[PDB]
Structure formats: C-alpha cells, structure tokens
C-alpha cells in the first residue's frame, strides 16, 4: 500500500548509467498494446480494489 513513480534508468549490475541505455541498463517502464486482434487473455481489465 504505497505508490512510487520514477524515470531514472535501472542498473541491473555494476554498469554506471546516467542517461544512456547499456546492455545491462534497461528502462524500467514498459508499455502494453491493446488491439481487438488480441484474445481474452491479452485485454485490459479495469481492476479496482
């Protein structure tokens, strides 16, 4: 029960990344894709708790 927002690139190892995207530094925000071609198992559900 806490929220977090960030944009800095995550370093999975010892590689110093400060704005560049290395092979070990990945962007921690990955987006979806929502098309009618996808079936039931790949569609967005507005889950509310």
């Amino acid at each position: 029960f806490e929220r977090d927002i960030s944009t800095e690139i995550y370093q999975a190892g010892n590689k110093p990344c400060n704005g560049v995207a290395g092979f070990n530094c990945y962007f921690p925000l990955r987006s979806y894709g929502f098309r009618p071609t996808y079936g039931v198992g790949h569609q967005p559900y507005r889950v509310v708790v």
Epitope: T7, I9, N18, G19, V20, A21, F27, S31
Partner: antibody
Framework: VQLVQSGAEVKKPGASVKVSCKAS????????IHWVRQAPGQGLEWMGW????????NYAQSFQGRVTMTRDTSITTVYMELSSLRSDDTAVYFC????????????????????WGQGALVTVSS | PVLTQPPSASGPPGQSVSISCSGS????????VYWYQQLPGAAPKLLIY???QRPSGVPERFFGSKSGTSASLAISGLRSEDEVDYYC???????????FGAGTKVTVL
Amino acid sequence: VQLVQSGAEVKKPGASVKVSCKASGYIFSDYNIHWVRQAPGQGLEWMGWISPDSDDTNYAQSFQGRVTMTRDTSITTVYMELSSLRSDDTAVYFCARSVGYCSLNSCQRWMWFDTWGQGALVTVSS
Amino acid sequence: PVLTQPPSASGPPGQSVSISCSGSRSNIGTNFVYWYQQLPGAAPKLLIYKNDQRPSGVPERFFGSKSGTSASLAISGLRSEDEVDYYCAAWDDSLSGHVFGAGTKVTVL
C-alpha cells in the same frame, strides 16, 4: 492509407491559412494527428497533438497561440487555422500520421510517424 | 538543446558508410531515435523505428543502431540512382517535444 488533399493558397502575413488532408480506410478515433513543416536547410518543428476523442490537446514550449486546431467527427478531417504568419513559415505542410494513441507525457516515446503523402505548400508573401 | 547532424557525407559506391547523430543523455539512449528520409519532389518516409525493428516495405539492406549519446545508421553500400537525405529525431522531457536533426547529403565518389 491515403493523405490526398489540395494545395494551400498563398496568404498575406497577418492572415489565416487552412490545410486539411482527407482520412479514409480506417476509423478516426484512435490516431492522434500531428502537423509539421519541412523548413529548408534544417530540421522540423513540433507544436502539439490533436486527439479526436476528447478535448485534451496540448501545446509545445515555443508555440502557444500561433496554431489553433478544431476537430471534426462528421467528416473525420482536422481543420487548421493559423494566425500571425511570418517569413520563417516558408515551408511545405504535411499532416503526420502517428501510430497508436497517447495522452499523458510518458507514452509518446513508443510512437513513430507512419504515413507521408501529397503535402501542402505554403509560403507567406509580400 | 538541438539535435545536430553533419551537413553532408561522402561515400563511394561499393562500400558501407554510416551517419552519426550527436545528441545528449536525456534525448538519446533513454529515448528512442527515429530516422526520416525524404525523396526529392515527394513525401518523406521513416527508415528505422525503435533502433532495432525494421518496417515492412523495405528489403534487408539498411542497418541502424544507437550507442549511448550517438546513434549510427549503417548504409551497406550505395546506389547512384537514389540519393536521399536522412533526418534525425528524438524526444526530450525538457522541451517536452519532438526535436529534429540537421540532415545529411549523401553523394557518390
């Protein structure tokens, strides 16, 4: 996909010009449309995106009130109403087809410009 | 800041050439780089998107990649019958907008 339109007519500075390109072959409720001009000898400039679903269009840092946009759901063609034309407006107008959809300011990195075709030519004149 | 490019490049046919697009940390690497190419007397067209997937409509001839601050578009050989400028574009949080490169002329030798 097609972007067939008509050539833009020459306008005096301190007037208005209209460019609109036809949309067909798809539903015009998912693709935010962009406007852009190809400046000679250099790159291009961006001013904002137009969403045909909700009134949530924004503006860039350097373009506040020079550009004005209105949407249309009956004809599915965006309308352009430019104001205060100057000498640096001497460039051709192409309507930029953008894949996908994006509203907030952290989803636009994934989109890329899809279709260019038969753009308009506009040069403000003495 | 503004993305810059060399005004022109000189590559003879028969050998590979590359085009560099110098940038910064906040525009290149953490944000994807697109490459626009426009025909003379016609409409532009995207060459490569997301620096690793090639669009459908072009054969396996070109190559593009990014390395930190700069991105390289490898052009394996050159045909004398087609000479087309290359544009460099990216995204920057500070300008919260799309900023475009200078553009490059490619010529035969």
